[PDB]
Tab-separated table of C-alpha atoms in Angstrom:
chain	number	residue	atom	x	y	z
A	30	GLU	CA	1.730	-35.383	-36.250
A	31	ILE	CA	5.037	-33.383	-35.961
A	32	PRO	CA	7.926	-34.344	-33.588
A	33	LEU	CA	9.243	-31.459	-31.440
A	34	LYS	CA	11.969	-31.002	-28.799
A	35	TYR	CA	10.612	-27.640	-27.494
A	36	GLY	CA	6.854	-28.067	-27.781
A	37	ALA	CA	4.295	-28.661	-25.049
A	38	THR	CA	5.228	-30.361	-21.741
A	39	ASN	CA	1.891	-30.514	-19.763
A	40	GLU	CA	-0.823	-32.984	-20.886
A	41	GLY	CA	-3.935	-31.086	-19.709
A	42	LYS	CA	-4.556	-28.759	-16.750
A	43	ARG	CA	-2.037	-28.825	-13.905
A	44	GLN	CA	-3.892	-30.075	-10.790
A	45	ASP	CA	-1.136	-29.613	-8.144
A	46	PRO	CA	-2.050	-27.322	-5.189
A	47	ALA	CA	-0.010	-24.357	-6.497
A	48	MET	CA	-1.882	-24.205	-9.839
A	49	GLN	CA	-5.205	-24.747	-7.932
A	50	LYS	CA	-4.381	-21.620	-5.933
A	51	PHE	CA	-3.465	-19.626	-9.039
A	52	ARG	CA	-6.849	-20.682	-10.508
A	53	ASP	CA	-8.935	-20.205	-7.348
A	54	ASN	CA	-7.591	-16.681	-6.849
A	55	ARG	CA	-9.426	-15.600	-10.131
A	56	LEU	CA	-9.197	-11.871	-9.603
A	57	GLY	CA	-5.907	-9.984	-9.755
A	58	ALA	CA	-4.458	-6.497	-10.288
A	59	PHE	CA	-1.761	-5.376	-12.705
A	60	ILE	CA	0.736	-2.666	-11.821
A	61	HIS	CA	2.576	-0.826	-14.607
A	62	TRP	CA	5.222	1.418	-13.099
A	63	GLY	CA	8.374	2.651	-14.682
A	64	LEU	CA	10.076	5.751	-16.020
A	65	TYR	CA	7.146	6.358	-18.406
A	66	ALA	CA	5.130	7.526	-15.383
A	67	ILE	CA	7.186	10.750	-15.180
A	68	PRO	CA	6.443	12.291	-18.610
A	69	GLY	CA	3.023	10.555	-18.523
A	70	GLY	CA	2.251	10.704	-22.241
A	71	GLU	CA	3.871	14.087	-22.933
A	72	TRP	CA	7.260	14.721	-24.557
A	73	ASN	CA	8.638	18.198	-25.305
A	74	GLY	CA	5.224	19.855	-24.943
A	75	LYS	CA	3.449	17.380	-27.325
A	76	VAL	CA	0.846	15.083	-25.683
A	77	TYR	CA	0.754	11.731	-27.493
A	78	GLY	CA	-2.530	9.699	-27.577
A	79	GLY	CA	-0.820	6.263	-27.741
A	80	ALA	CA	-0.012	4.092	-24.717
A	81	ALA	CA	2.099	6.155	-22.250
A	82	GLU	CA	4.453	3.224	-21.590
A	83	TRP	CA	5.383	3.329	-25.330
A	84	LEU	CA	6.136	7.123	-25.336
A	85	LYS	CA	9.856	6.447	-26.102
A	86	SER	CA	8.605	4.956	-29.407
A	87	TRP	CA	5.941	7.579	-30.244
A	88	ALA	CA	8.242	10.543	-29.569
A	89	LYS	CA	11.308	8.815	-31.239
A	90	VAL	CA	13.414	9.310	-28.039
A	91	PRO	CA	16.934	7.751	-27.916
A	92	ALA	CA	17.779	5.263	-25.104
A	93	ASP	CA	20.495	7.453	-23.471
A	94	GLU	CA	18.075	10.414	-23.257
A	95	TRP	CA	15.052	8.267	-22.168
A	96	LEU	CA	16.994	6.531	-19.368
A	97	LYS	CA	18.135	9.995	-18.071
A	98	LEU	CA	14.594	10.064	-16.551
A	99	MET	CA	16.183	7.963	-13.748
A	100	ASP	CA	17.516	11.309	-12.406
A	101	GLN	CA	13.894	12.399	-11.659
A	102	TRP	CA	12.774	9.022	-10.216
A	103	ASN	CA	11.853	10.028	-6.701
A	104	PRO	CA	8.391	8.685	-5.692
A	105	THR	CA	8.098	10.533	-2.363
A	106	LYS	CA	4.500	9.388	-1.650
A	107	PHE	CA	5.291	5.683	-2.271
A	108	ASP	CA	4.198	3.394	0.600
A	109	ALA	CA	4.114	-0.359	-0.056
A	110	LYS	CA	1.754	-0.953	2.903
A	111	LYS	CA	-0.822	1.466	1.429
A	112	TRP	CA	-0.630	-0.203	-1.990
A	113	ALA	CA	-1.247	-3.564	-0.396
A	114	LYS	CA	-4.219	-2.340	1.664
A	115	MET	CA	-5.659	-0.885	-1.568
A	116	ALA	CA	-5.358	-4.313	-3.223
A	117	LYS	CA	-6.913	-6.085	-0.196
A	118	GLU	CA	-9.855	-3.648	-0.179
A	119	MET	CA	-10.409	-4.208	-3.933
A	120	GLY	CA	-10.770	-7.977	-3.382
A	121	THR	CA	-7.699	-8.981	-5.452
A	122	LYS	CA	-6.060	-12.249	-4.444
A	123	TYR	CA	-2.911	-11.514	-6.477
A	124	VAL	CA	-0.934	-8.742	-8.083
A	125	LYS	CA	1.244	-8.805	-11.246
A	126	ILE	CA	4.071	-6.271	-11.128
A	127	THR	CA	6.187	-4.859	-13.964
A	128	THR	CA	9.687	-5.903	-12.764
A	129	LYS	CA	11.067	-4.464	-16.033
A	130	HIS	CA	9.103	-3.063	-19.043
A	131	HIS	CA	10.405	-2.586	-22.647
A	132	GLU	CA	12.306	0.580	-21.612
A	133	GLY	CA	14.735	-1.673	-19.599
A	134	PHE	CA	14.429	0.096	-16.194
A	135	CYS	CA	14.439	-2.465	-13.328
A	136	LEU	CA	12.328	-1.989	-10.157
A	137	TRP	CA	14.798	-4.187	-8.249
A	138	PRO	CA	18.541	-3.406	-7.839
A	139	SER	CA	19.787	-5.809	-10.503
A	140	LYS	CA	23.488	-6.496	-10.446
A	141	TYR	CA	23.485	-7.113	-14.266
A	142	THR	CA	22.722	-3.517	-15.449
A	143	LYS	CA	23.081	0.128	-14.386
A	144	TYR	CA	19.422	0.956	-15.276
A	145	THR	CA	17.827	0.173	-11.906
A	146	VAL	CA	16.138	1.803	-8.896
A	147	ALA	CA	19.569	1.717	-7.073
A	148	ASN	CA	20.984	4.438	-9.349
A	149	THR	CA	18.081	6.822	-8.761
A	150	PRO	CA	17.598	9.463	-6.041
A	151	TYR	CA	15.122	7.054	-4.417
A	152	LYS	CA	17.670	4.146	-4.250
A	153	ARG	CA	15.252	1.680	-2.627
A	154	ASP	CA	14.313	-1.854	-3.717
A	155	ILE	CA	10.695	-1.011	-4.664
A	156	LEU	CA	10.002	-4.502	-5.906
A	157	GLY	CA	11.217	-6.067	-2.591
A	158	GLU	CA	9.082	-3.686	-0.551
A	159	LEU	CA	6.016	-4.589	-2.653
A	160	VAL	CA	6.629	-8.364	-2.377
A	161	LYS	CA	6.769	-8.140	1.412
A	162	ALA	CA	3.784	-5.771	1.774
A	163	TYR	CA	1.535	-7.820	-0.543
A	164	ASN	CA	2.609	-11.149	1.031
A	165	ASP	CA	1.839	-9.688	4.493
A	166	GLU	CA	-1.778	-9.115	3.322
A	167	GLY	CA	-2.043	-12.732	2.082
A	168	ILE	CA	-1.787	-11.615	-1.549
A	169	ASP	CA	0.301	-13.675	-4.020
A	170	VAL	CA	2.790	-11.838	-6.213
A	171	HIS	CA	3.453	-12.524	-9.911
A	172	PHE	CA	6.241	-10.962	-11.972
A	173	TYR	CA	5.792	-9.289	-15.328
A	174	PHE	CA	9.007	-9.419	-17.348
A	175	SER	CA	9.612	-7.913	-20.783
A	176	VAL	CA	12.178	-9.892	-22.846
A	177	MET	CA	12.447	-7.090	-25.420
A	178	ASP	CA	14.805	-4.519	-23.879
A	179	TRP	CA	15.357	-1.095	-25.438
A	180	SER	CA	18.183	-0.318	-22.921
A	181	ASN	CA	20.558	-3.157	-23.925
A	182	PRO	CA	22.334	-2.690	-27.301
A	183	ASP	CA	22.818	-6.520	-27.662
A	184	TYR	CA	19.037	-6.807	-28.243
A	185	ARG	CA	18.095	-7.867	-31.800
A	186	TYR	CA	14.688	-7.702	-33.599
A	187	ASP	CA	15.874	-10.338	-36.089
A	188	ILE	CA	18.917	-12.633	-36.609
A	189	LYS	CA	20.080	-11.646	-40.172
A	190	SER	CA	23.945	-12.267	-39.623
A	191	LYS	CA	26.505	-14.253	-37.495
A	192	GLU	CA	27.245	-10.977	-35.537
A	193	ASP	CA	23.539	-10.601	-34.748
A	194	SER	CA	23.540	-14.189	-33.479
A	195	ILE	CA	26.660	-13.595	-31.282
A	196	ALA	CA	25.123	-10.361	-29.756
A	197	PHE	CA	21.729	-11.947	-29.188
A	198	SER	CA	23.260	-15.013	-27.502
A	199	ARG	CA	24.899	-12.611	-24.997
A	200	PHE	CA	21.469	-10.911	-24.542
A	201	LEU	CA	19.787	-14.248	-23.673
A	202	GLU	CA	22.532	-14.897	-21.020
A	203	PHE	CA	21.852	-11.433	-19.578
A	204	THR	CA	18.144	-12.262	-19.571
A	205	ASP	CA	18.734	-15.651	-17.937
A	206	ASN	CA	20.831	-13.897	-15.289
A	207	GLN	CA	18.088	-11.369	-14.437
A	208	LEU	CA	15.509	-14.172	-14.267
A	209	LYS	CA	17.691	-16.303	-11.911
A	210	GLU	CA	18.301	-13.192	-9.831
A	211	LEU	CA	14.534	-12.499	-9.443
A	212	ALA	CA	13.691	-16.114	-8.586
A	213	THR	CA	16.371	-16.322	-5.833
A	214	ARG	CA	16.018	-12.765	-4.426
A	215	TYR	CA	12.192	-13.128	-4.159
A	216	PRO	CA	11.423	-16.821	-3.663
A	217	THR	CA	7.723	-16.292	-2.722
A	218	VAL	CA	6.992	-15.405	-6.398
A	219	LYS	CA	4.157	-17.591	-7.825
A	220	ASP	CA	4.243	-16.742	-11.508
A	221	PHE	CA	6.346	-15.234	-14.263
A	222	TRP	CA	4.422	-13.440	-17.005
A	223	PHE	CA	6.498	-12.844	-20.105
A	224	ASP	CA	5.880	-10.050	-22.652
A	225	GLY	CA	7.846	-8.587	-25.610
A	226	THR	CA	8.447	-12.081	-27.048
A	227	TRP	CA	6.950	-11.541	-30.541
A	228	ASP	CA	10.063	-10.467	-32.466
A	229	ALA	CA	11.631	-12.806	-35.040
A	230	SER	CA	14.800	-13.161	-32.863
A	231	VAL	CA	12.786	-14.907	-30.187
A	232	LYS	CA	10.684	-16.978	-32.678
A	233	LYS	CA	14.001	-18.306	-34.115
A	234	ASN	CA	15.223	-19.337	-30.578
A	235	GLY	CA	12.365	-21.528	-29.339
A	236	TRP	CA	14.884	-23.707	-27.448
A	237	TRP	CA	15.597	-20.745	-25.131
A	238	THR	CA	11.945	-20.107	-24.271
A	239	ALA	CA	11.572	-23.779	-23.225
A	240	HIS	CA	14.819	-23.558	-21.246
A	241	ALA	CA	13.674	-20.443	-19.365
A	242	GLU	CA	10.438	-22.248	-18.434
A	243	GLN	CA	12.347	-25.373	-17.170
A	244	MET	CA	15.033	-23.242	-15.446
A	245	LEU	CA	12.474	-21.212	-13.446
A	246	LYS	CA	10.477	-24.306	-12.465
A	247	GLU	CA	13.576	-26.020	-10.915
A	248	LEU	CA	14.336	-22.743	-9.000
A	249	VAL	CA	10.772	-22.063	-7.694
A	250	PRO	CA	8.623	-25.083	-6.720
A	251	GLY	CA	5.147	-24.899	-8.335
A	252	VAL	CA	5.728	-21.600	-10.186
A	253	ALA	CA	3.462	-20.777	-13.158
A	254	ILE	CA	4.646	-19.564	-16.549
A	255	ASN	CA	2.485	-17.924	-19.270
A	256	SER	CA	2.021	-19.177	-22.825
A	257	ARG	CA	3.322	-15.857	-24.199
A	258	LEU	CA	6.888	-16.813	-23.336
A	259	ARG	CA	6.921	-19.867	-25.457
A	260	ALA	CA	7.852	-20.609	-29.087
A	261	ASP	CA	8.462	-24.127	-30.443
A	262	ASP	CA	11.165	-25.633	-32.757
A	263	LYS	CA	9.354	-24.087	-35.809
A	264	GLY	CA	8.650	-20.629	-34.282
A	265	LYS	CA	4.889	-21.111	-33.559
A	266	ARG	CA	3.962	-19.092	-30.410
A	267	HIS	CA	1.561	-19.926	-27.471
A	268	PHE	CA	0.381	-23.237	-28.919
A	269	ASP	CA	2.957	-25.506	-30.557
A	270	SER	CA	2.829	-26.974	-34.103
A	271	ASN	CA	0.597	-29.901	-32.861
A	272	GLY	CA	-1.882	-27.345	-31.375
A	273	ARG	CA	-0.880	-28.062	-27.752
A	274	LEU	CA	-0.648	-25.255	-25.204
A	275	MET	CA	2.871	-24.351	-24.050
A	276	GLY	CA	3.453	-23.023	-20.571
A	277	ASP	CA	0.911	-23.425	-17.790
A	278	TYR	CA	-1.838	-21.099	-18.928
A	279	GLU	CA	-3.046	-19.243	-21.994
A	280	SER	CA	-2.306	-15.501	-21.926
A	281	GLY	CA	-3.426	-13.943	-25.244
A	282	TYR	CA	-6.698	-12.216	-24.166
A	283	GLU	CA	-5.449	-8.658	-23.694
A	284	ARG	CA	-8.202	-6.021	-23.776
A	285	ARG	CA	-10.622	-8.570	-25.367
A	286	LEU	CA	-12.364	-11.770	-24.209
A	287	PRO	CA	-13.457	-15.087	-25.677
A	288	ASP	CA	-16.992	-15.214	-27.090
A	289	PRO	CA	-19.361	-16.939	-24.623
A	290	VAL	CA	-21.051	-18.980	-27.378
A	291	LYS	CA	-18.322	-19.600	-30.003
A	292	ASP	CA	-15.052	-19.823	-28.018
A	293	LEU	CA	-15.890	-22.634	-25.572
A	294	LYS	CA	-12.613	-24.349	-26.523
A	295	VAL	CA	-10.948	-22.104	-23.855
A	296	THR	CA	-12.563	-24.068	-20.989
A	297	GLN	CA	-10.195	-26.984	-21.773
A	298	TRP	CA	-7.182	-25.091	-20.417
A	299	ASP	CA	-6.188	-22.579	-17.740
A	300	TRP	CA	-6.089	-18.987	-18.957
A	301	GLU	CA	-5.800	-15.419	-17.797
A	302	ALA	CA	-6.970	-12.171	-19.326
A	303	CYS	CA	-5.887	-8.641	-18.577
A	304	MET	CA	-7.463	-5.286	-19.221
A	305	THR	CA	-7.114	-1.535	-18.953
A	306	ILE	CA	-9.586	0.969	-17.529
A	307	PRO	CA	-9.257	3.442	-20.445
A	308	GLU	CA	-9.166	2.003	-23.957
A	309	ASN	CA	-5.390	1.559	-24.223
A	310	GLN	CA	-3.254	2.964	-21.357
A	311	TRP	CA	-1.205	0.663	-19.123
A	312	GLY	CA	1.381	3.117	-17.757
A	313	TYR	CA	0.271	6.425	-16.215
A	314	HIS	CA	-1.009	8.910	-18.788
A	315	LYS	CA	-1.905	12.393	-17.529
A	316	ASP	CA	-4.963	12.894	-19.767
A	317	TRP	CA	-7.711	10.224	-19.541
A	318	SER	CA	-10.180	12.436	-21.470
A	319	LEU	CA	-8.572	11.199	-24.765
A	320	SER	CA	-10.369	7.832	-24.994
A	321	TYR	CA	-13.308	6.072	-23.352
A	322	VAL	CA	-12.942	5.155	-19.657
A	323	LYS	CA	-14.775	2.070	-18.391
A	324	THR	CA	-17.258	2.341	-15.535
A	325	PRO	CA	-17.035	-0.117	-12.589
A	326	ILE	CA	-19.975	-2.190	-13.748
A	327	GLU	CA	-18.324	-2.501	-17.183
A	328	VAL	CA	-15.229	-3.854	-15.390
A	329	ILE	CA	-17.192	-6.244	-13.165
A	330	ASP	CA	-18.944	-7.576	-16.280
A	331	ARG	CA	-15.584	-8.520	-17.777
A	332	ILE	CA	-14.357	-10.118	-14.563
A	333	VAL	CA	-17.397	-12.341	-14.263
A	334	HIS	CA	-17.267	-13.086	-18.026
A	335	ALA	CA	-13.754	-14.442	-17.591
A	336	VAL	CA	-14.592	-16.617	-14.611
A	337	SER	CA	-17.745	-17.902	-16.375
A	338	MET	CA	-15.447	-19.343	-19.061
A	339	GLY	CA	-12.883	-20.813	-16.730
A	340	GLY	CA	-10.304	-18.005	-16.701
A	341	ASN	CA	-8.784	-15.306	-14.510
A	342	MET	CA	-9.017	-11.573	-14.931
A	343	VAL	CA	-6.432	-8.953	-14.076
A	344	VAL	CA	-7.287	-5.290	-13.891
A	345	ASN	CA	-4.541	-2.772	-14.581
A	346	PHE	CA	-3.380	0.275	-12.626
A	347	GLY	CA	-0.721	2.770	-13.750
A	348	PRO	CA	0.595	4.502	-10.589
A	349	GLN	CA	1.643	8.160	-10.751
A	350	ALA	CA	5.325	9.244	-10.724
A	351	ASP	CA	5.003	10.306	-7.049
A	352	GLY	CA	4.041	6.738	-5.982
A	353	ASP	CA	0.353	7.415	-5.364
A	354	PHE	CA	-2.709	6.315	-7.425
A	355	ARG	CA	-4.870	8.801	-9.331
A	356	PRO	CA	-8.456	9.365	-8.074
A	357	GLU	CA	-10.202	7.456	-10.908
A	358	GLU	CA	-8.221	4.309	-10.006
A	359	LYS	CA	-8.978	4.627	-6.255
A	360	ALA	CA	-12.659	4.995	-7.058
A	361	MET	CA	-12.543	1.902	-9.326
A	362	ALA	CA	-10.778	-0.207	-6.693
A	363	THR	CA	-13.223	0.796	-3.963
A	364	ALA	CA	-16.282	0.094	-6.266
A	365	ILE	CA	-15.004	-3.320	-7.285
A	366	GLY	CA	-14.250	-4.192	-3.654
A	367	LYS	CA	-17.784	-3.278	-2.477
A	368	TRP	CA	-19.332	-5.552	-5.148
A	369	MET	CA	-16.815	-8.403	-4.627
A	370	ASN	CA	-17.424	-8.359	-0.897
A	371	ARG	CA	-21.153	-8.859	-1.413
A	372	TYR	CA	-21.165	-11.236	-4.440
A	373	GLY	CA	-17.663	-12.755	-4.493
A	374	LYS	CA	-18.885	-16.268	-3.644
A	375	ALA	CA	-19.780	-16.362	-7.381
A	376	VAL	CA	-16.236	-15.339	-8.463
A	377	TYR	CA	-13.545	-16.722	-6.104
A	378	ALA	CA	-12.813	-20.412	-6.586
A	379	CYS	CA	-15.469	-20.586	-9.355
A	380	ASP	CA	-15.325	-22.060	-12.864
A	381	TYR	CA	-17.267	-22.825	-16.063
A	382	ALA	CA	-20.684	-24.283	-15.364
A	383	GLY	CA	-21.425	-26.138	-18.624
A	384	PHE	CA	-24.757	-24.353	-19.230
A	385	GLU	CA	-25.892	-22.724	-22.470
A	386	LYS	CA	-25.336	-18.947	-22.308
A	387	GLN	CA	-28.363	-16.695	-21.725
A	388	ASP	CA	-28.937	-12.987	-22.238
A	389	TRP	CA	-29.397	-11.960	-18.603
A	390	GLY	CA	-25.747	-12.597	-17.699
A	391	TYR	CA	-23.372	-15.379	-16.740
A	392	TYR	CA	-23.334	-18.660	-14.910
A	393	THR	CA	-20.475	-19.688	-12.630
A	394	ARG	CA	-19.957	-23.040	-10.878
A	395	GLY	CA	-18.723	-23.342	-7.283
A	396	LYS	CA	-16.472	-25.947	-5.585
A	397	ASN	CA	-19.459	-27.942	-4.269
A	398	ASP	CA	-21.628	-27.788	-7.470
A	399	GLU	CA	-23.332	-24.513	-6.574
A	400	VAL	CA	-24.501	-22.866	-9.857
A	401	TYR	CA	-24.640	-19.079	-9.615
A	402	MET	CA	-26.616	-16.848	-12.006
A	403	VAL	CA	-24.963	-13.447	-12.177
A	404	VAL	CA	-27.507	-11.041	-13.582
A	405	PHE	CA	-26.353	-7.989	-15.539
A	406	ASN	CA	-29.321	-7.418	-17.865
A	407	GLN	CA	-32.729	-7.431	-16.149
A	408	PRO	CA	-35.517	-8.806	-18.368
A	409	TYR	CA	-38.790	-6.842	-18.637
A	410	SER	CA	-40.451	-10.271	-18.814
A	411	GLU	CA	-39.453	-10.736	-15.110
A	412	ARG	CA	-38.283	-14.212	-15.987
A	413	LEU	CA	-34.686	-15.419	-16.207
A	414	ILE	CA	-34.455	-18.294	-18.699
A	415	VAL	CA	-32.392	-21.259	-17.563
A	416	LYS	CA	-31.845	-24.105	-19.971
A	417	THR	CA	-30.156	-27.122	-18.333
A	418	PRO	CA	-27.855	-29.797	-19.792
A	419	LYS	CA	-29.173	-33.346	-20.375
A	420	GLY	CA	-29.892	-35.000	-17.012
A	421	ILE	CA	-29.738	-31.858	-14.842
A	422	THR	CA	-32.657	-30.457	-12.836
A	423	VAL	CA	-33.063	-27.287	-10.741
A	424	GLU	CA	-34.427	-28.031	-7.236
A	425	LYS	CA	-34.122	-24.617	-5.620
A	426	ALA	CA	-33.227	-21.009	-6.343
A	427	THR	CA	-32.089	-18.556	-3.699
A	428	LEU	CA	-31.117	-14.873	-3.710
A	429	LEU	CA	-27.488	-14.891	-2.536
A	430	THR	CA	-27.544	-11.743	-0.413
A	431	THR	CA	-30.771	-12.378	1.563
A	432	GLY	CA	-31.399	-16.167	1.443
A	433	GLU	CA	-34.965	-15.523	0.139
A	434	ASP	CA	-36.542	-18.330	-1.948
A	435	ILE	CA	-37.030	-17.647	-5.713
A	436	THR	CA	-39.812	-19.278	-7.719
A	437	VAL	CA	-38.664	-21.742	-10.396
A	438	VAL	CA	-41.181	-22.785	-13.048
A	439	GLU	CA	-40.597	-25.649	-15.515
A	440	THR	CA	-41.545	-24.400	-19.021
A	441	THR	CA	-40.388	-27.314	-21.157
A	442	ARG	CA	-38.128	-30.386	-21.010
A	443	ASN	CA	-34.740	-28.977	-19.871
A	444	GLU	CA	-35.889	-25.424	-19.401
A	445	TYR	CA	-37.084	-23.216	-16.583
A	446	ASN	CA	-38.130	-19.638	-15.889
A	447	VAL	CA	-36.443	-18.430	-12.681
A	448	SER	CA	-38.266	-15.367	-11.353
A	449	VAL	CA	-36.462	-12.136	-10.692
A	450	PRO	CA	-36.419	-11.055	-7.038
A	451	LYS	CA	-39.579	-9.284	-5.762
A	452	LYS	CA	-37.509	-6.058	-5.133
A	453	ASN	CA	-35.145	-5.098	-7.940
A	454	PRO	CA	-31.653	-5.264	-6.455
A	455	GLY	CA	-30.576	-2.151	-8.483
A	456	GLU	CA	-27.198	-3.622	-9.380
A	457	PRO	CA	-25.797	-6.765	-10.913
A	458	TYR	CA	-26.848	-9.560	-8.554
A	459	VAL	CA	-26.527	-13.288	-7.865
A	460	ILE	CA	-29.102	-16.051	-7.655
A	461	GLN	CA	-27.750	-19.352	-6.365
A	462	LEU	CA	-29.192	-22.543	-7.755
A	463	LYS	CA	-29.249	-25.964	-6.274
A	464	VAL	CA	-29.033	-28.570	-9.029
A	465	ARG	CA	-29.321	-32.368	-9.099
A	466	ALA	CA	-27.866	-34.719	-11.702
A	467	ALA	CA	-29.832	-37.930	-12.486
A	468	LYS	CA	-28.167	-41.346	-11.783
A	469	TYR	CA	-21.982	-33.207	-11.920
């Protein structure tokens, strides 16, 4: 048992209405937009296979020359109302926006640096337009913020001298200033999602991470803050030195997901995962033939997987330089939306069900103890195995889309065979169960 000034603050899950809304939303979209969209993976005629938002690093481009891309920032086709309608149609209840990525370029007209939308041909407060357009559609907005900043020469990767410490203290004031600015300019913000916090400089300044959390919470009632921000007194990230979660939700599952059998620990706290459509591209990259691109069903699988284990999922989009979305992303959003509209009672406001995992798919639990079976792998046996926890029985099974009754046969103590539907739905589908707990 270690004493700590800058360790965990929350005891378990926040149960205030604002966290309940964050949780109940479940499905969100990620927007990565910045100067990296212009080159789109290519520098000086060489196409790089790494993440397009890291092109400055792959092509060894100096800050001065990279930030000169501001002179071509002119997204003529940008329309915040279209973006928001696209998100509504997809079934997303929130959107996480890159306010500033590692490159340092701000999508709002910050008063604390020259590297902003204001000093571009386009001039407009893109971030402010998005906040309004999304909020008009009833969609919450969350802010991605990269602490690591390649545009500011006071940034330090490590504190090796007293000069380093003096520079970096000025950098943290700059950062604090931008954060205060965002929270007061855009007070409808529901969440701040920190990234670029892994460097030794930040690990050595745990006190600051805890201060940023507390500062933003006093400025924005009920705001959420991700675990990735936080380091403790000793430099342990996400979870403090007593194994307690810092911030309001766990945010380490990036392009991977907890194991449905072995990683049940994650149901004890709030968490959010994010993912890309190709293997590893967040910002716009002009050539998607370079790695595997997920199909819509592969994406829906991951969404449901997350919710089945008590977490959120955020799907990423990397808008083009002109301010429109590429065709593959429009197709994905439309396909997800179609499926969510039909089967979203098993996703929105749902949580971990407490049932042993089975091969056919995933269980989710509803607000009134509905247990949904989301079927992704159809058994040739025509029987969907359902093993119940001690004291639970299955009284009825119903196909969600049609209301048709589904035969349930007891096979042993605590186990049933739920029949597949008479007509194969031809897609991942939901069977709703009615369960009863003995004197959930």
